[PDB]
Design a protein around this ligand. Structure first.
Ligand SMILES: NC[C@@H](OCc1ccc(Cl)cc1)c1ccccc1
Ligand SMILES: NC[C@@H](OCc1ccc(Cl)cc1)c1ccccc1
Ligand SMILES: NC[C@@H](OCc1ccc(Cl)cc1)c1ccccc1
Ligand SMILES: NC[C@@H](OCc1ccc(Cl)cc1)c1ccccc1
Ligand SMILES: NC[C@@H](OCc1ccc(Cl)cc1)c1ccccc1
Ligand SMILES: [Br-]
Ligand SMILES: [Br-]
Ligand SMILES: [Br-]
Ligand SMILES: [Br-]
Ligand SMILES: [Br-]
Lengths: 205, 205, 205, 205, 205
């Protein structure tokens, strides 16, 4: 309690907040998805609503501390507003992302920050053939809105999406779910742009 | 009036806010449900809307005071933003929780805090067989999003859900309603994961 | 202008805000309703949407002043956020209350505060028989969420609801509208729980 | 840039904010409407949605300055939260007013403030006969919620509503649109109550 | 990291925020659109929902710095709340604009600021003839709500709208998309009013 109050004061009130990664000091943001349910499928507007967990993970030198100095505290929990968070957003989103969980991140002594917010995302997806046996395949690209490849480097611990937490009595069943890291190049800009393409193949139950 | 103004000033303006429970200093959060109505049942998207009271109860040493010192004041009411609140959220939620009551908590001299917000929750539930006599059973797990068993220990005063405040002229009648405390242990991590499973068996009137 | 600026400064900037009524210093909150329209009636979910004026009235010793001292000012208007307001909310509400008017209260020299916000409330009501000649009767209890009878004492100036401001070309006509003060007791505790029961009998036009 | 920063600092940071008009110091608020479109017409709930511009105009002695003293600056733009705004709201509104434009006001050297927010208003209107050639007439009264005639005096520069900005390919065409200043007198209270009655006669295209 | 923290501190914490452009010091705001999808088309209310990128670009002398002085930093990213942003809004909007991306702007050493927020806009558009081969043409004017031509001068780098990022499996295909700069003078006011007219010709797939 007392040691934890001193730790948060020496990390946020003492040192100024992280201004973001630069080309000289890049940051590696490892992200993984945990698909919960395909709630709505709109064939009239070509919109699909997803319920998932966006496991965001990054390591900062500014959020590093010795546990021995702060009463053997290895890790702590703090609000997402108190710390810097990556701007990883869906490029093909149709409606603003609805946060279903409290925005709280876990910070460890080595500076590794883990933030897993539960989100409801309505994105661009044509569901023509969802009632079919082969189903319909729909992709949605996730990545940094302003930072490029030289600033934020996206990573995936596994190519497979976590479907263990998926709703058993869902209206739509998953046939395939993959999170592939893609390195894109744009004519405008010489810098590369990394994006995690969430490809989901689903059909009606 | 005058003694109450001094009490709130000596508790919030003097001492810094609670940073959250740690492994060394755990917290026991006792929660109970009071089901009011099953407003909406969506068979098209497998979503069910519930109106209930989430009776959150926890004891803090920081919010302790002697009533004799503060003009025999045994308890007081303060905004939920002024004090620390547990991150108890539904794991199978589809849409953000709608708060129907003012977020105000009751703090007693022994440090016990009681916060009962009225909420509207839309969660994952297959209502196939709601028109049947046996009805349909739907569960929703409630627990801390970031804190584990070593930090927040969930508790239930009773295994039965309060149905005395349930709407008599509701579209759906309750056959069974139970709030069971579940302790999950995984091969990954040695920490326990406590969640209150709200199981409700209901049918059409 | 100049005398009014000094009055508001000597009342809010000088003295700290009202912490709420205690058992030793109780408060009498007189409330009355002015029904405007029954906008929506949902037979599918048993929800009824009401448009009304909640005339909240209470007297505080802290908001008392001599008009002769402040340039013969008898009363003034201030934002509902600047002053303390009672937590009077509908116990059978289904969706959060939508405020249709600016939240501004009128404070008189004797300390009497009048706050009349226009609200849209969607509450639990079975409308089976609204198309009938006798119509359907639906009640909704209004009261303090955290304070009991020893802290907040509810009062009604009249048992009849103001229907003079009711919409003439409404889809539903009012047959009866009453605001009854009800006292609820529990064996445990000696504190009474006062609530204003808004009973409305209506039918289709 | 530099002269404008000094001007805003000498007007808001120096002098305290306007507490509102009193009986001794009344304020004249001139308002005009610019109807854009009749988006929705609900015959089931007797609700009509309007898209319009509410041109609010008032003169304050506190917001007066000499342009010669502040580098020949005749007028400036500031947020609606930084200055005092009148509580002009629709008395027959069914849903909260949706603001479609940024809430920014234009303040001139003579103290005249102009605030024109684009709004979407859902109000009480029976549309029985909208498909007819003569159409349907629907009125909505606009006025101060707390201030009476002795505090806020409403004014209209013209009795005709601006229909030059009205959508040509709208589902409903305007036959007549008038903004009439009405003074209401009650035997109860000697104070008058001024309201701008927006009368619109429309039919299907 | 260290040089970037000093740069943001010397730009925002040192100098006060931009008060907005004046007649003496005008600002040129270059804006371009990147149409993603025509999600909804409502023939009942004459409303059309668009998903697009509003590329806002302006140069400020206050946000200028020498990269050699701040460790060869050419550009940085900061929140849209930390800096001044133009009040560019759609004049024919029916519902408030939904922001789908994080509001973060890119600031370069020469003072050029680029802010590209992804937005969902529901505006006035008659879709009679969308099922036809020639399709339906719908325009929406974009511009500063309070600042005139003498304060904010709108510009377009190209007359053609970026359709490279448009959804291939959309319900509606684009036949033509143009962003035309229009300078209109009104009888009311002596100042010119510049607006970017987004004209889109589309049909069903
Ligand atoms: N298409 C998604 C993303 O692409 C990366 C990118 C960024 C800037 C530019 Cl100038 C070009 C490309 C994006 C993000 C923000 C705006 C436009 C596009
Ligand atoms: N499903 C909701 C919750 O489950 C508890 C839980 C946590 C971690 C692990 Cl490894 C297993 C289970 C949750 C909270 C945070 C992250 C992911 C999930
Ligand atoms: N039934 C609605 C409301 O009643 C007031 C009341 C408060 C406390 C107690 Cl111990 C009993 C009743 C309410 C509000 C909050 C919690 C439980 C109930
Ligand atoms: N209709 C909105 C407002 O009208 C002004 C008005 C004030 C007093 C009276 Cl007695 C009548 C009308 C209002 C505000 C409070 C109560 C009732 C109405
Ligand atoms: N139609 C869009 C815009 O037109 C420019 C304009 C500005 C002020 C005035 Cl007094 C007249 C016209 C606008 C912006 C604000 C209010 C009304 C209209
Ligand atoms: Br940080
Ligand atoms: Br606390
Ligand atoms: Br008060
Ligand atoms: Br002001
Ligand atoms: Br700025």
């Amino acid at each position: 309690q007392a040691n934890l109050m001193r730790l948060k004061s020496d990390l946020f009130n003492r040192s100024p907040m992280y201004p973001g990664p630069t080309k000289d000091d890049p940051l590696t943001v490892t992200l993984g998805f945990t698909l919960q349910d395909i709630v709505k499928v709109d064939s009239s507007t070509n919109e699909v609503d997803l319920v998932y967990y966006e496991q965001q993970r990054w390591k900062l030198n500014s959020l590093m501390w010795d546990p021995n100095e702060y009463g053997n505290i290895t890790d702590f929990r703090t609000s997402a507003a108190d710390i810097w968070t990556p701007d990883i957003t869906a490029y093909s989103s149709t409606r603003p992302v609805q946060v279903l969980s409290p925005q709280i991140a876990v910070v460890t002594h080595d500076g590794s920050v883990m933030f897993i917010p539960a989100q409801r995302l309505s994105f661009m997806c044509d569901p023509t053939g969802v009632d079919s046996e082969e189903g319909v395949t729909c992709a949605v690209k996730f990545g940094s809105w302003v930072y490029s490849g030289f600033e934020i480097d996206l990573k995936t611990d596994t190519d497979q999406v976590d479907l263990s937490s998926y709703y058993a009595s869902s209206k739509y069943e998953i046939l395939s779910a993959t999170q592939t890291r893609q390195v894109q190049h744009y004519s405008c800009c010489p810098e590369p742009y990394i994006d995690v393409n969430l490809v989901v193949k689903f059909r009606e139950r």
